[PDB]
Write an enzyme that holds these catalytic residues in place. Structure first.
Site, PDB file in Angstrom:
ATOM      1  N   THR A   1      39.160 -24.123 -31.464  1.00  0.00           N
ATOM      2  CA  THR A   1      38.271 -24.877 -32.378  1.00  0.00           C
ATOM      3  C   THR A   1      36.986 -25.193 -31.669  1.00  0.00           C
ATOM      4  OG1 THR A   1      40.078 -25.965 -33.587  1.00  0.00           O
ATOM      5  CG2 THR A   1      37.933 -27.030 -33.610  1.00  0.00           C
ATOM      6  N   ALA A  49      45.070 -32.293 -36.390  1.00  0.00           N
ATOM      7  CA  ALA A  49      44.560 -32.125 -37.741  1.00  0.00           C
ATOM      8  C   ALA A  49      44.883 -33.295 -38.645  1.00  0.00           C
ATOM      9  CB  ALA A  49      45.099 -30.860 -38.333  1.00  0.00           C
TER      10      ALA A  49
END
Ligand SMILES: [Mg+2]
Ligand SMILES: [Mg+2]
Ligand SMILES: [Mg+2]
Lengths: 212, 198, 250, 244, 233, 241, 242, 204
Positions: A1, A49
């Protein structure tokens, strides 16, 4: 990410990739890593997340409550601290988050706060967070200027995510861009890295070593 | 750990604190101010664990600011430090201890003398001419022990901190990105914007 | 269910009087007489054993109680209230002092602790004050001998001699004449016996009187030998015969 | 139910007064007078004893003047036992502050805290208030010699000279008459004693009926000395001033 | 006399009465009428809804507690909300834990015990609402009448609220007839409406007025309001 | 454990305890606040039932809640302390969490909220206090002045007064304060305030205390002498006629 | 004395009925529901001319799609508004949608009878009922525009138009006659203005009355003084005709 | 990791002829880093002296706790606490934290004002009392001090001689301990007077 946010003349640029991996498995190439807190504030998702998604959607609620109570828009300083203080309450329990709280208010101007699960809260001009952060910071640092145009700025952020998506195995999928202005944020689209890499290569001449 | 140094000269206390904030593989910021003004004549610098550091410092400031208002008075540096020590000493046997080391430089308007207090995360307080936390002292104390004099001017102190920072920049492994220096005296607290090269 | 009486039962009346405290003091006035006299080398506390029947065994009811080996108490008022105050006093002597300092508390402080227990019954929710006044006599290294009176309000005061209960006014008067600061303990026991004789209606002897002194250390009442710092309790209840022997030298 | 037996100690009268507080102040007015007089070089606390006798041990006694600190003392007017409850919490607060800040507790901070406790019994809880009024005499590095007073309501105020207990109106009038801003302690002693002498409800002011204390900063030292007068010393100072 | 014995539910009168409870029973009597009646296949609740002005809605009287049970209220509505909530929870627990549908007899027993607690302790106050509970469980159709005193009774039909006595008589007469309306939901309902229309006086039951609920064999508790009660006037 | 409902509705829709709390305010020394174009002045009369006070220490009638907001009141002195302390804590708590000091409306809404809570919570009686809260919002220059009462009701005023004889002085302000030319100066704002208090205090210099609050944490308490200079100049715009 | 949750011999809770009496002493508030929005208007009623009228908050936003007006002991409503706002936001968090107006209302009304002294049943700490009534108006997709009147008794009714406060018996009577299924937002605003004008002691101007509305498109908006002055003017003229 | 070895330091008390003595070093360090050379470990509440070695935050906390407790004691009792009594107070205070102890080694030295008998006592971190008639040692150089004291000590020394003895016991014990030294202080305590002397010693 790889997620980044930087401050300049016309507001804030927020650019993030959209890959999620579980080990070597690419779980998703379409993850939304920018949480739309409300129409004026953005937060980037890095770390866990659920943690980011849950607490930032919650942040949006605390922000709406403040505005109802005070009849005035919540400052980025105060919105970030709500999250930062909550995260500090759970310190040691295992929450995982590295996030940028971005906003542009009349009182403060374009403002970005880096907030993580360790309880750190930092105001800054440029922040990259995630497995691909180092790659994004290379591009950013050498091309960032305060006087960039909103077009070039959007480009710098997009290119920085691409630098990271190419090299970092855990970043890629597509790039999601946002421009934050005082009247709110404006989304500047979802760009598939597959297609974006080739375009950038031919037009810019970069990534020479890659054959195509 | 970050760099935190303090030196009490004849008429003031100088606190020099590193500017970097490093998280893992990248330096996130190079302009961090690791200090909070507790009262107009008291400043505290701090170094330690990530969020604890600022949370603790802001909690102490809030508490000292409240006292000042309820009482319409500014506590002596000695009083502020004892309060700070008691707070640190409470957390040591707490569920999750604050891991913060602080330096408190204050100018006592009543005694008319500057004072520097060094208190580590355990609540170990000691009053000194100069001090530091973590490894900082390991490189700088030999210099301070050698050149320090109680009747130094603010300029002589600054020159000494400079030498200290130079030894740190030569032999210490991490790039702390320079220091922000602040002086605490009878007129309050001012930031010396001239230290990158003096 | 549950003690919903969380409010005071003693409150100020328009004249500034604390009703329940005044009424408790009245209860104390109808009680048997008890007195205490402080001498140069001792203190004597005494009271009459108003046995409420001849089938009762008067010895199984002690009105003069040991609180610590050097402190004793007697009262006038409601017996059961005194009994629970004694338990609480013996206990606090341990909890707030012996378990902390390794020594028994000095008279004034133990007095101060009983007094606090009584004051709280004067303000806490849902209770009435204690209907007793106590005379506590004791000794301790740094203060010597002392006698204190504690009232239902929780006020306590030190005395050279005093009397409480039924004929306390007359008795306090007999004591004021007879008392002087050169009295040996035997003389105080004497004056105590005389003062009590006037308050006592019927049979006056060693089985109807209860007297105790706080005097010299009594090694024969320690129970062990070998440790020299603790020399024995200064509190001693006089036996039926010891009282009689003194009554004959009237 | 239990509502039936509740006196409701924390309600307002139709005139906005606190019943129990007003009634507690009435009780207080029957207690021996306590007087405090503040000088440039010390403070005087004098008090008249209630319920005495020839047999009471005056030597080993203390029912009106109590030490809260080496620099703070109070004179009590009201229920002695209620006073001891509060006095002990004040003694602890003084030590809590010393531990926390390593400086003796400023007088007003101690006074305010005590008053706040009294105030509490006034607004919640359903318990009767404390029937006590205090005169606090103390010293600190910020304001020097101070004298305050607190009553059952929990309100406190500062004075150069004040009295609590019986005959306050009379005592205050006499104080306001002979008091001068530049007074010396030796002079304050006389005034306090004079005032009690003219307001006593009893025959003559004798030593056995008094408690006396002064807080002085003896110039040949530095630490402030709190002196609780002993019986013979009260007899001595009572002669020099002229009450015999 | 009274203000001595009617200040709390925790006080028995000299004749052994519980006045606070009796006063609660009165709020029910000033509530709008509701009827309950059942055959061997369905149970219906019919209720006359009341308004405040001619510019407002008509307060609901029927509450679904689960797919096989529900009730009509009369009296203090906030209280019916509190008790139907409990019933909803008790019904839910039976299903979740035992995979079993709560029996009406049990629902009644549970309601009684909840009401009683509020009549023996100080500070509390009795519930001020009455309820007609209908349901279809393993033993068939049921109608129960709950009163704030804690008394719950199983019936063939009934009614509560102001002028309830009229319909109560119609039902008491029509018993032999409605107890046999098996397999014909609409008829049962019609009997319920006929019943409820015997306690009217003010106006005639309209489309904004009536509320009906039915449950039975192959009919999950369902509430018909306004629009869908047209065919029954 | 004590939770008796002390504030309850009586037959006519009134809550006596709250109404009686107001009566306590009616007995307290008068407090007045009037606002200028760039300042707010708070005036208070000194309780004259007893005299021989040590002015240095005695709890002042006007209290700083923060560097930029003050509160004065009329009512039970002891109760005021509770409100003031809660206010000061909330003021520091706001700086700590929002990173900006409280606005004056916010601080008012807080104190008022506390007052109301004490009107419908078990076992407590209402505060016998009404307050005047004044100051300036951070980085703003428009003066603010609010008033709260025992019921917990609050609102802003161009000028207002509370306490004994407030009805009287309120009448003075109603026909001497014009929103078209609010006291355009610290000097004239103070004068108007004193004027109003003079109509009640009854010729007394030391009897009036004035506190002037300007923008950006500039709060000052005028000295006994600075005010006397005003009373004098005031006895002139009354004696020349 | 006598308990706070005691029933009267008629079956009415004493404290709730008395609560209703305190509400009859409050400023009038009127709400009118049309098919283009719901209007909420209130009488400000300052106790003196030195009071800055804009600080009188009797109409408050609960959420973008829900607003409310109050009448009675207005301070009592502060905790009620706090609850309503938190309920709406919380609903959005848990369900990613707007809370229905009935639901918001019902949630507020659940607080109502939660008063008493250890009333055996659950834990209800509030020494007395609320002394304020509320008019809650808003819009949701399933039932459109709605106006609700929430009382301290816990019961709430839906109304096409409703007045509460001192001039309610009179005002409600006017509303009964002037309301019809086809009113326009502009007509509603006018009525509210007219009726407030009638029952008020003082002469209605833009500084002692406040209007607001809630529409599907723009949500809850409190009309600023200028917008209302124009509407008041537009009234003086429409009335001065016949 | 050993809380009793982080800061360093020693205290020794000895009894003499109508006197006692308690001495300590002045070092405060952090592992190998010397931090302060002015850290006294001997405190006194009236005429009772208490030296405390161990973790410095606890040493400071305990001094503050005993000042608190002895201050209240003086107020209630109206007399200063005695050595025998204080000793019991220290012990009970330490055992109160039996399962989360203060990492210290207290030492009490003083003379009873009524009887005049010299008194010294030592404690382990949980309160066990060691009332010796000769000497008490504590600190990171306790073995060394035991060695010094067992040889150097002889009963009934006069104030002037005890001084030399305790000083040498202390000084030489400290010079064989890495964590002690950097200065030393000795208190010679008599019924009427208490003398405090700072010793000159190596500074390494
Ligand atoms: Mg060892
Ligand atoms: Mg060494
Ligand atoms: Mg070395």
């Amino acid at each position: 990410t790889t997620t980044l946010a930087f401050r300049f003349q016309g507001g804030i640029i927020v650019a993030v990739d959209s890959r999620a991996t579980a080990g070597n498995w690419v779980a998703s190439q379409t993850v939304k890593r920018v949480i739309e807190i409300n129409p004026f504030l953005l937060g980037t998702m890095a770390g866990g997340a659920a943690d980011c998604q849950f607490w930032e959607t919650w942040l949006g609620s605390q922000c709406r409550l403040h505005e109802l109570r005070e009849k005035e828009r919540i400052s980025v300083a105060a919105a970030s601290k709500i999250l930062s203080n909550l995260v500090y309450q759970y310190k040691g329990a295992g929450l995982s988050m590295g996030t940028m709280i971005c906003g542009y208010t009349r009182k403060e101007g374009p403002t970005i706060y880096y907030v993580d699960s360790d309880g750190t809260r930092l105001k800054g001009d440029i922040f990259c967070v995630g497995s691909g952060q180092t790659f994004a910071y290379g591009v950013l640092d050498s091309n960032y200027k305060w006087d960039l145009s909103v077009e070039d700025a959007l480009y710098l952020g997009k290119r920085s995510i691409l630098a990271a998506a190419h090299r970092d195995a855990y970043s890629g999928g597509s790039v999601n861009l946002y421009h934050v202005t005082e009247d709110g944020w404006i989304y500047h689209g979802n760009h598939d890295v597959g297609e974006l890499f080739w375009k950038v290569k031919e037009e810019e001449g970069s990534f020479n070593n890659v054959i195509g | 750990m970050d760099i935190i140094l303090g030196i009490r000269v004849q008429d003031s206390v100088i606190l020099a604190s590193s500017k970097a904030v490093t998280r893992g593989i990248s330096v996130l910021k190079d302009s961090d101010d690791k200090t909070r003004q507790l009262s107009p004549h008291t400043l505290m610098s701090f170094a330690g664990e990530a969020g604890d550091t600022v949370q603790f410092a802001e909690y102490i400031q809030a508490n000292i600011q409240l006292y000042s208002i309820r009482e319409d008075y500014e506590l002596s540096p000695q009083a502020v430090s004892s309060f700070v020590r008691q707070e640190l000493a409470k957390s040591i046997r707490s569920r999750r201890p604050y891991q913060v080391n602080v330096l408190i430089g204050g100018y006592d308007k009543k005694k008319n003398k500057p004072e520097l207090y060094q208190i580590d995360y355990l609540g170990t307080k000691v009053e000194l001419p100069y001090g530091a936390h973590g490894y900082s002292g390991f490189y700088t104390f030999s210099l301070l022990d050698h050149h320090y004099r109680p009747d130094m001017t603010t300029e002589e102190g600054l020159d000494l901190l400079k030498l200290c920072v130079q030894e740190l920049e030569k032999r210490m492994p991490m790039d702390f990105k320079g220091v922000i220096v602040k002086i605490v005296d009878k007129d309050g607290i001012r930031q010396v914007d001239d230290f990158q090269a003096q | 269910m549950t003690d919903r009486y969380s409010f005071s039962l003693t409150t100020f009346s328009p004249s500034g009087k604390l009703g329940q405290i005044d009424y408790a003091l009245t209860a104390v006035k109808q009680g048997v007489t008890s007195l205490g006299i402080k001498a140069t080398n001792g203190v004597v506390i005494a009271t009459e054993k108003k046995s409420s029947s001849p089938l009762a065994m008067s010895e199984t009811l002690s009105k003069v109680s040991l609180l610590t080996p050097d402190i004793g108490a007697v009262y006038s008022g409601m017996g059961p209230d005194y009994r629970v105050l004694v338990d609480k006093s013996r206990k606090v002597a341990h909890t707030s002092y012996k378990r902390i300092y390794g020594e028994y508390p000095p008279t004034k402080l133990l007095v101060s602790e009983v007094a606090k227990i009584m004051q709280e019954a004067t303000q806490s929710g849902g209770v009435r004050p204690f209907g007793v006044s106590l005379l506590i006599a004791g000794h301790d290294e740094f203060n010597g001998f002392s006698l204190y009176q504690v009232d239902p309000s929780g006020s306590y005061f030190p005395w050279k001699a005093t009397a409480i209960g039924k004929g306390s006014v007359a008795a306090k008067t007999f004591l004021e004449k007879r008392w002087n600061d050169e009295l040996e303990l035997e003389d105080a026991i004497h004056i105590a016996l005389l003062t009590l004789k006037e308050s006592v209606e019927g049979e006056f002897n060693g089985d109807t009187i209860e007297l105790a002194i706080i005097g010299d250390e009594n090694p024969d009442l320690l129970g062990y030998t070998g440790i020299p710092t603790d020399k024995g309790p200064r509190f001693r209840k006089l036996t039926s015969q010891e009282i009689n022997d003194r009554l004959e030298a009237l | 139910g239990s509502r039936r037996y509740d006196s409701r100690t924390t309600i307002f009268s139709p005139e906005g007064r606190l019943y129990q507080v007003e009634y507690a102040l009435e009780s207080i007015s029957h207690a021996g007078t306590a007087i405090g007089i503040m000088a440039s070089d010390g403070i005087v606390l004098a008090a008249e004893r209630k319920v005495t006798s020839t047999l009471l041990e005056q030597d080993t006694s203390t029912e009106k003047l109590y030490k809260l600190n080496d620099k703070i003392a109070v004179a009590v007017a009201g229920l002695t036992a209620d006073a001891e409850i509060l006095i002990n919490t004040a003694r602890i607060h003084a030590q809590n502050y010393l531990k926390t800040y390593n400086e003796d507790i400023p007088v007003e901070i101690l006074v305010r805290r005590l008053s706040d406790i009294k105030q509490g019994y006034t607004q919640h809880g359903g318990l009767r208030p404390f029937g006590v009024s205090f005169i606090y005499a103390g010293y600190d590095d910020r304001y020097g010699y101070q004298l305050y007073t607190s009553n059952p309501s929990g309100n406190y105020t500062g004075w150069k000279a004040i009295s609590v207990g019986a005959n306050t109106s009379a005592a205050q009038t006499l104080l306001q008459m002979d008091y001068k801003d530049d007074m010396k302690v030796d002079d304050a002693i006389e005034l306090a004693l004079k005032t009690l002498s003219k307001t006593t409800d009893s025959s003559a002011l004798t030593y056995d009926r008094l408690e006396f204390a002064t807080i002085r900063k003896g110039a040949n030292d530095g630490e402030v000395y709190q002196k609780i007068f002993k019986p013979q010393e009260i007899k001595d100072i009572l002669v020099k001033t002229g009450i015999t | 006399f009274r203000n001595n014995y009617d200040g709390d539910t925790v006080t028995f009168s000299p004749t052994g009465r519980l006045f606070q409870v009796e006063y609660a029973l009165e709020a029910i009597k000033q509530g709008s009428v509701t009827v309950g009646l059942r055959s061997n296949t369905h149970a219906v609740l019919v209720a006359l809804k009341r308004n405040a002005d001619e510019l407002s809605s008509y307060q609901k009287k029927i509450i679904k507690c689960d797919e096989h049970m529900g009730l009509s209220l009369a009296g203090l509505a906030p209280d019916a909300r509190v008790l139907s909530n409990y019933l909803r929870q008790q019904c839910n627990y039976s299903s979740l834990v035992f995979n079993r549908k709560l029996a009406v007899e049990r629902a009644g027993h549970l309601l009684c015990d909840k009401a009683q607690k509020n009549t023996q302790s100080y500070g509390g106050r009795p519930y001020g609402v009455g309820l007609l509970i209908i349901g279809y469980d393993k033993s068939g159709a049921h109608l129960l009448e709950f009163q704030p005193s804690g008394n719950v009774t199983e019936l063939y039909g009934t009614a509560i609220g102001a002028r309830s006595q009229g319909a109560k008589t119609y039902l008491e007469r029509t018993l032999d007839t409605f107890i046999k309306i098996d397999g014909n939901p609409d008829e049962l309902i019609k009997a319920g409406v006929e019943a409820i229309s015997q306690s009217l006086r003010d106006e005639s039951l309209t489309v904004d007025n009536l509320s009906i609920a039915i449950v039975g064999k192959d009919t999950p508790f369902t509430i018909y309001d306004g629009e869908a009660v047209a065919k029954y006037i | 454990g004590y939770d008796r409902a002390l504030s309850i509705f009586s037959p006519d829709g009134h809550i006596f305890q709250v109404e009686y709390a107001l009566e306590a305010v009616k007995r307290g020394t008068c407090a007045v606040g009037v606002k200028g174009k760039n300042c707010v002045v708070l005036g208070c009369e000194r309780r004259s039932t007893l005299k021989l006070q040590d002015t240095r220490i005695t709890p002042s009638k006007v209290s700083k809640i923060d560097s930029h907001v003050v509160l004065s009141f009329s009512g039970l002195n002891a109760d005021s302390r509770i409100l003031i302390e809660k206010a000061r804590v909330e003021a520091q708590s706001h700086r700590l969490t929002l990173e900006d000091p409280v606005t004056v409306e916010y601080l008012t809404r807080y104190v008022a909220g506390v007052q109301q809570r004490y009107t419908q919570s078990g076992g407590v009686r209402p505060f016998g206090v009404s307050t005047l809260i004044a100051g300036f919002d951070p980085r703003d220059d428009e003066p603010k002045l609010y008033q709260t009462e025992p019921s917990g009701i609050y609102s802003s005023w161009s000028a207002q007064t509370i306490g004994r004889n407030s009805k009287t002085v309120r009448e003075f302000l109603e026909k001497n304060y014009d929103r078209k030319e609010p006291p355009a100066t610290v000097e004239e704002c103070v004068k108007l305030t004193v004027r109003s208090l003079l109509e009640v205090v009854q010729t007394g210099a030391k009897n009036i205390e004035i506190t002037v609050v300007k923008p950006d944490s500039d709060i000052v308490a005028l000295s006994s002498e600075e005010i006397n200079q005003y009373v004098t100049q005031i006895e002139q715009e009354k004696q020349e006629q | 004395d006598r308990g706070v949750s005691t029933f009267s011999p008629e079956g009415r809770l004493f404290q709730v009925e008395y609560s209703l009496e305190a509400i009859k002493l409050g400023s009038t508030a009127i709400g009118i529901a049309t098919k283009e929005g719901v209007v909420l208007g209130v009488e400000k009623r300052a106790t003196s001319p030195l009071l800055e009228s804009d600080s009188i908050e009797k109409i408050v936003e609960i959420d973008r799609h829900i607003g409310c007006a109050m009448s009675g002991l207005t301070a009592d409503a502060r905790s009620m508004i706090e609850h309503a706002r938190t309920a709406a936001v919380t609903h959005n968090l848990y369900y990613d949608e707007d809370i229905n107006v009935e639901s918001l209302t019902q949630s507020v009304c659940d607080l109502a009878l939660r008063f008493g002294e250890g009333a055996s049943g659950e834990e209800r700490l509030m020494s007395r009922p609320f002394g304020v009534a509320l008019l809650i108006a808003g819009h949701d997709a399933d039932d459109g525009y709605q106006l609700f009147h929430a009382e301290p008794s816990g019961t709430f009714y839906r109304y096409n138009a409703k007045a509460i406060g001192s001039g309610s018996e009179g005002a409600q009577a006017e509303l009964l006659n002037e309301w019809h299924s086809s009113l326009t937002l502009k007509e509603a605003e006018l009525l509210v203005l007219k009726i407030l004008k009638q029952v008020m002691e003082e002469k209605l101007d833009e500084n002692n009355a406040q209007l607001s509305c809630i529409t599907k498109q723009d949500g809850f908006k409190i009309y600023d003084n200028e917008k209302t002055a124009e509407l008041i003017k537009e009234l003086k003229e429409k009335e001065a005709a016949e | 990791s050993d809380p009793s070895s982080i800061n360093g330091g020693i205290v020794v008390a000895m009894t003499g002829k109508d006197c006692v003595a308690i001495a300590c070093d002045l070092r405060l360090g952090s592992q190998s880093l010397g931090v302060s050379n002015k850290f006294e470990k001997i405190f006194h509440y009236g005429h009772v002296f208490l030296g405390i070695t161990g973790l410095a935050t606890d040493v400071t906390t305990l001094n503050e706790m005993f000042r608190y407790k002895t201050n209240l004691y003086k107020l209630k009792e109206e007399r200063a606490i005695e050595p025998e009594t204080f000793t019991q107070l220290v012990s009970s205070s330490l055992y109160e934290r039996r399962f989360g102890p203060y990492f210290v080694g207290p030492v009490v030295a003083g003379i009873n004002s009524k009887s005049g008998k010299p008194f010294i006592a030592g404690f382990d971190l949980i309160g066990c009392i060691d009332e010796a008639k000769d000497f008490i040692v504590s600190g990171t150089a306790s073995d060394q001090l035991f060695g010094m004291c067992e040889s150097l000590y002889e009963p009934n020394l006069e104030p002037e001689d005890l001084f030399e003895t305790i000083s040498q016991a202390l000084l030489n014990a400290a010079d064989r301990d890495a964590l002690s030294g950097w200065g030393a202080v000795v208190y010679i305590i008599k019924k009427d007077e208490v003398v405090k002397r700072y010793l000159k010693m190596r500074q390494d």
